[PDB]
């Protein structure tokens, strides 16, 4: 974590092996709300979530 200066951000849940056996395959479809109110800090957050 802190003994070098590179720090791991590894999560088991995130892992592909973990995910395929977590659940079944899926057809998803991301909707993004692009109305005017979102512009600002919130719009910035959405692009990084998707």
């Amino acid at each position: 974590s802190r003994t070098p200066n590179k720090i791991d951000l590894y999560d088991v849940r995130r892992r592909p092996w973990y995910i395929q056996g977590a659940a079944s395959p899926k057809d998803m479809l991301i909707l993004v709300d692009v109305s005017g109110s979102v512009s600002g800090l919130t719009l910035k957050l959405i692009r990084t979530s998707v």
Binding site: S35, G36, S37, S39, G40
Partner: protein
């Protein structure tokens, strides 16, 4: 005569609330209540 001045002095305190509930929204966006207030602006204007 007497309340004619005060029926339109009561009208304008209703207009001041009608500007104080307008919720400004960024980049040309709206909600339902600002779309029923812009009609109200028309109603207020006619009386004056």
């Amino acid at each position: 005569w007497k309340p004619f001045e005060t029926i339109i002095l009561l009208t304008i305190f209703a207009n001041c609330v009608a500007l104080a509930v307008y919720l400004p929204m960024p980049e040309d966006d709206n909600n339902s209540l600002n779309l029923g207030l812009e009609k109200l602006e028309y109603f207020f204007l006619t009386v004056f």
